[PDB]
Amino acid sequence: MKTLIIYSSETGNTKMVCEKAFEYINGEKVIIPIKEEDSINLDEFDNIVVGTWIDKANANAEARKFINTLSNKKIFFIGTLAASLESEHAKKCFNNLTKLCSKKNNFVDGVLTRGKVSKDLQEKFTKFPLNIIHKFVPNMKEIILEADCHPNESDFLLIKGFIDKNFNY
Ligand code: HEM
Ligand SMILES: Cc1cc2nc3c(=O)[nH]c(=O)nc-3n(C[C@H](O)[C@H](O)[C@H](O)COP(=O)(O)O)c2cc1C
């Protein structure tokens, strides 16, 4: 059995948790960024685990496009987002990723972990249009601040549980 972990990451959060997933998996496995897809033959992999960061409650474009090149693959996701993992927003994100993976592939499971908001985006949040767009989103300031320390051990434990559940202990 061969497992591929293939990910998008701009500021490293998704890469970080996907690297933990790679470490925890036993047996044959490869981890690459999506940009290096040509380094492997997708046909050789029984499990495809896609790492994605949340962009407006959905998979980031690079990861969305990659998933939409796949058909009938046994597929999983590992997502990062800045919202609280207990929030309704996170549940909406999880459902959106489930819908994306299940549409044309064979979706088994996924996990969301938390990741800090980039310095650049934290600055843009104080400017038009993001400040107006999120004006009435509750707890906006604290959500961003409480994401700053993530990913951290709490997220790695979520990854460990996800790998335990789906691949091996
Ligand atoms: C460039 C970055 C972002 C953009 C362009 C963006 C865009 C939007 C837009 C347009 C909406 C209104 C709903 C819609 O029309 O789709 C929205 C709502 C919301 N955004 Fe963002 N957002 C960004 C970053 C973030 C981040 C970093 C967080 C969390 C830390 C966040 C959390 C939310 C929440 C909780 C809502 C309320 C609606 C919901 O629960 O989905 N957003 N955002
Ligand atoms: C353009 C953009 C849109 C984002 N939209 C959301 C969002 O809708 N919900 C959320 O919780 N986090 C959102 N975030 C925060 C990222 O999902 C989070 O910081 C992620 O861990 C970054 O991953 P990376 O470091 O692998 O690039 C957004 C970030 C960016 C840059």
Numbering used by the authors: 1 to 169
Task: Copy text verbatim from the article accompanying this structure deposition.
In contrast to flavodoxins, FldH and HmuF do not stabilize the FMN semiquinone but instead cycle between the FMN oxidized and hydroquinone states. Both FldH and HmuF then catalyze multiple reductions of anaerobilin through hydride transfer from the FMN hydroquinone.
All of the 169 residues of FldH are present in the structure along with the heme and FMN cofactors. A notable feature of the structure is the helical cap domain (Lys116-His150) that bisects β5 and ⍺8 of the flavodoxin motif. This helical cap, comprising ⍺5, ⍺6, and ⍺7, provides a cleft for heme to be positioned planar to the si-face of the FMN isoalloxazine ring. The heme iron is coordinated on the proximal side by Nε of His134 in ⍺6 (Fe-Nε distance of 2.2 Å) and on the distal side by a water molecule, a coordination environment that is consistent with the electronic absorption spectrum of the heme-bound protein. The side chains of Leu121, Phe125, Leu130, Ile133, Val137, and Met140 form van der Waals interactions with the proximal side of the heme, creating a hydrophobic interface. This places FMN N5, the site of hydride transfer, 3 Å from C5 of the tetrapyrrole ring (i.e., at the ⍺-meso bridge).
